[PDB]
Homo-oligomer: A and B are copies of this chain.
Amino acid sequence: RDIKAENTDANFYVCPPPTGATVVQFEQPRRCPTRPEGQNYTEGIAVVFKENIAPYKFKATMYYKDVTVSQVWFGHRYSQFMGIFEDRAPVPFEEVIDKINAKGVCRSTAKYVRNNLETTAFHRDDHETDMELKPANAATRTSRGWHTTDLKYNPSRVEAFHRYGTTVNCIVEEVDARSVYPYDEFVLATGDFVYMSPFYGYREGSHTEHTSYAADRFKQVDGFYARDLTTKARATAPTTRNLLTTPKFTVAWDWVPKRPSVCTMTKWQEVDEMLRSEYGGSFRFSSDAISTTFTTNLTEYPLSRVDLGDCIGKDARDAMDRIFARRYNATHIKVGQPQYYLANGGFLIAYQPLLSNTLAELYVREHLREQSRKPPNPTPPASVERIKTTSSIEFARLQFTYNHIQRHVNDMLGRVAIAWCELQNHELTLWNEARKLNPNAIASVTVGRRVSARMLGDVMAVSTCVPVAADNVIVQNSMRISSRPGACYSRPLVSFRYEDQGPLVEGQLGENNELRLTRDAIEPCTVGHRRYFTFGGGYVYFEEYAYSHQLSRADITTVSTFIDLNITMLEDHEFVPLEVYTRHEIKDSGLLDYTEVQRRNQLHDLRFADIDTVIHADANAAVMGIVGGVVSAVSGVSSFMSNPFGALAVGLLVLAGLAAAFFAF
């Protein structure tokens, strides 16, 4: 009667009833945490402003007179230029107002200040004539220009002799004008600047504006009237005019005020769904529409400290009105006056709170509390400042996304934390009637190690089991009683030994390999007896209360009490760099890098022309030498006579030679 387990994988445990010595208890439903109240989002409309870098850009009209006078020396079949003087000349005030404005013409004469002198240039070197302004030729992507002279003047051919030819052209050319903050100078598309502020005048203290030019160069015309140079129909509108002359030209333009025309800020974006939140001592402005969150201090930014920010109010007012009348007008209602929070990163924010008609009951609170939010801090003390604005926007996209992801994931994580907690709490009843049914199993699964257990009233008493090797356990074949039939064992018989040499000890195989000491599990004998029992890592099958054979585990088809669960972590992912256009594509997109251009235009020498070489040439170095010295004495004499006083005594002499000789004849 010698039988051992097929698989010694799982050791047998002999586990006796315990004493009241050791005794343990279960936990109880730890009061589970609760949800958060959630961040209160105040709906509103936003409009965000940015530092202006786009220069102030306007229109003006230029008036000038190109004065080009040339030497020409002649040969037998040929004429060469000996020098071309080429100048830009201002047109006087009166000649613009009278000859150019009213009559659309211009003097053929120039009279202007250059190089500490007055000059007067005759066109053709001929008598002054009022000449006509005719439209400039067809020109592409340019302004509309005008001129009098379409071709310059040059003297008639006198064989081998120097002539001078004067030419004057009265040109009018309307142009654009650009200006950068603080707007004290302005440029012309001709590359010429004007060193005067574009808003100077006589009206509302306009003498305050800085101009280096003396007051007389520029005059302002109150209630001025303009007439087109081609159409020549007077403009219906009366425009206050301004006219400033330079040593090269004279420009005129229409005058407008300052603050309702320029602004350090500029309107950047319009958000109809901007959500304000208050957290950790700051506001976050989440446009769900454009995926954006903004960080602002609690107090509104004081607009007064905004410099020249009169664009702000007007712009924000118009935009917000249009949006609210469009899409919010019958669903919510306005709450308080608009707010100008300062957006971390240099983005000026206009934000309008608003509440639904659904819960207008609350408006009193909200209104008061919105009014609390602008400080009157500038009032008790004027020093002004600009707003420094960045050029990248990514903190807001990333910050929004991380808060929306963060919102969802932490939200769900919380919900499932609660659900798990209350599930484990809910189980203890199942574990409680279950622990009542079979104490040994539940106590072993609970404490962690295999132990005995018995109910000691409303508590559980335990004591550690005893390990027993499989090669030291015997199965006896029979399950019936030879002495008393009709009442036979319900579970097989085992003869284990606690030590490989230890005495053989009989017992009754119990559930889950517990080699119970007492042989007391008897049932009445019954027909059709098929029983699979637990033994070692496998099973042991008896038919009709008698040892059939031992089986491995997978011999029997297998089902499960388990609900599958399949999680895959998010694999890593590298983020490669990327620029849309590189900065060298931009320095290259600049059709001319002025730097490169001048760098070339100034090597116009050392490449193919030497400046480190000096030449002295003498015609007389090039009895006969003595005679040549004689003409030099004459040559040096003529030098004394090349100039005024020596020259005067000679003209007086020349008068004599011809005079005296003839009167005698």
- Known contacts A80-B120, A458-B539, A635-B158; A195 and B606 CB within 8 A of each other: yes
How many Å lie between the Cα of A247 and that of B578 in the bound state? 47
- Complex contact B665–A402 (CB within 8 A): no
Q: Which residues of B contact A169 (CB under 8 A)?
A: 609
Q: Which of B531, B580, B591, B634 contacts A178 (CB 8 A)?
A: B591
Count class of interface residues, chain A: 35 or more
27 A-B pairs with C-beta separation under 8 A: A53-B585, A54-B589, A69-B81, A69-B83, A70-B115, A81-B114, A81-B121, A115-B152, A156-B617, A157-B618, A187-B595, A280-B572, A290-B578, A391-B581, A395-B575, A397-B398, A397-B578, A402-B575, A404-B573, A412-B568, A416-B565, A419-B564, A423-B563, A427-B562, A431-B561, A590-B594, A592-B594
Answer yes or no: A426 CB below 8 A from chain B CBs: yes
Sample of 11 further A-B pairs with CB below 8 A, known A394-B397, A394-B578, A457-B532:
A27-B558, A67-B81, A69-B80, A142-B603, A147-B608, A291-B575, A393-B578, A399-B574, A410-B569, A447-B559, A456-B530
A512 shortest CB reach to chain B, Å: 8
Q: Is A71 an interface residue (CB 8 A)?
A: yes
Could you tell me if A648 and B661 are in contact, using CB atoms closer than 8 angstroms? Answer: no
Interface check A368, CB cutoff 8 A: no
How far is B660's CA from A328's CA once the two chains are assembled, in angstroms? Answer: 113
Is A583's CB under 8 angstroms from B391's CB? yes
Contacting residues of chain A (367-411) with chain B, CB-CB under 8 angstroms: 389-395, 397-399, 401-406, 408-410
Chain B residues within an 8 Å CB radius of A654: 654, 658
Nearest B residue to A615 via CB reads B116
Contact at B569–A24, with CB atoms within 8 Å? no
With A116-B613, A391-B580 given, is the CB distance from A597 to B600 under 8 Å? no
- Nearest CB in chain B: distance from A468 CB, A: 18
With both beta carbons as reference points, the residue of chain B lying nearest to A405 in the complex is identified as B405
Q: Is the CB of B142 within 8 A of A607?
A: yes
With A79-B119, A212-B606, A457-B532 known as contacts, the answer to whether A446 contacts B561 (CB < 8 A) is yes
Q: Does A636 contact B (CB under 8 A)?
A: yes
Residues of chain B lying within 8 A (CB to CB) of residue A603? 139, 142, 195
The segment from A91-99, A227-235, A315-323, A436-444 found at the interface with B is: A436-444
Is the CB–CB distance between B409 and A409 below 8 Å? yes
Contact indicator per residue, chain A 628-665, by CB within 8 Å of chain B (1) or not (0): 00011011101110110000100101101111111011
Q: Does A150 contact B (CB under 8 A)?
A: yes
Nearest B residue to A542, CB-CB:
B457
Grouping DSSP codes into helix (H, G, I), strand (E, B) and loop, the A interface class, with mixed when no group exceeds half, is mixed
Query: How many copies, total?
Result: 3
CA–CA, A119 and B80, complex, Å? 5
**B residues within 8 A CB of A662?**
656-657, 660
User: A116 to B151, Cβ gap below 8 A?
Assistant: yes
Q: Is the CB of A597 within 8 A of B657?
A: no
In contact, A565 and B420 (Cβ under 8 angstroms):
yes
Partner of A395, one of B118, B119, B576, B610: B576
Residues in B with CB closer than 8 Å to A72 are: 117
For the complex, what is the distance from the CA of A231 to the CA of B27, rounded to whole Å?
91
Residues of chain B contacted by A154 (CB below 8 angstroms): 115-117, 615, 617
Residues on B with C-beta less than 8 A from A568 are: 412
Within 8 A of B (CB), among A149-175: 149-152, 154-161, 164, 166, 169, 171
- Chain B positions within 8 Å of A609 at CB level: 147, 149-151, 169
Q: Does A619 interact with chain B (Cβ within 8 Å)?
A: yes
Within 8 A of B (CB), among A263-303: 268, 280, 289-291, 295
In the complex the two chains form, what is the Cα distance from A322 to B423 in whole Å?
54
* Complex interface: chain B residues within 8 A of A657 (CB): 657-659, 661-662
Tell me whether B614 and A150 are in contact (CB under 8 A): no
Could you tell me if B427 and A532 are in contact, using CB atoms closer than 8 angstroms? no
Closest to A602 in B: B193
Q: Are B424's CB and A562's CB within 8 A?
A: yes
Chain B residues with CB below 8 A from A171, complex form: 608
Restricting to A108-128, which residues have a CB under 8 Å from any CB of B? Answer: 113-122
Q: How far is the CA of A404 from the CA of B78 in the complex (A)?
A: 82
Q: Give Cα distance in the complex from A361 to B416, angstroms.
A: 42
A325 CB within 8 Å of chain B: no
If A437-B433, A610-B150 touch, whether A191 touches B580 (CB-CB below 8 Å) is no
Given A139-B607, A592-B594: A614 touches B437 (CB 8 Å cut-off): no
Q: Nearest CB to that of A444 among chain B residues?
A: B429
Residues from chain B with Cβ under 8 Å of A610 in the complex: 116, 137, 150-151
Q: Does A582 contact B (CB under 8 A)?
A: yes
B139–A606 touching, CB < 8 Å: yes
- The closest CB in chain B to the CB of A427 belongs to B561
Contact residues in B for A632 (Cβ distance below 8 Å)? 159
A236: Cβ under 8 A from any B Cβ: no
Chain B nearest CB from A124 CB (Å) reads 11
Residues in B whose Cβ lies below 8 Å from that of A402: 401, 405, 573, 575
For the complex, is A534 an interface residue (Cβ under 8 Å from B)? yes
A579 touches B658 (CB 8 A): no
A268: which B residues are within 8 A, CB to CB? 580
Is A590 in contact with B581, judged by CB distance below 8 angstroms?
A: no
Residue of B with least CB distance to A531: B457
Rounded to whole angstroms, the CA-CA distance of A595 and B459 in the bound complex is 92
A225 at the interface (CB under 8 A from B): no
Q: Which residues of B contact A166 (CB under 8 A)?
A: 80
Complex Cα–Cα for A566 and B417 (A): 8
Contacts of A75 in B (CB 8 A): 120
Taking a contact as CB atoms under 8 Å apart, the answer to whether B398 and A159 are in contact is no
CA distance A553 to B24 in the complex (A): 11
Q: Do residues B608 and A598 form an inter-chain contact, with CB atoms below 8 A?
A: no
- Whether B595 and A458, one on each chain, are in contact in the complex, defined by CB atoms closer than 8 angstroms, is no
A661 proximity list for chain B (CB < 8 A): 657, 660-661
Specify which chain B residues have a CB less than 8 angstroms from the CB of A156 in the assembled complex: 617-619, 622
Is A567's beta carbon under 8 Å from chain B? yes
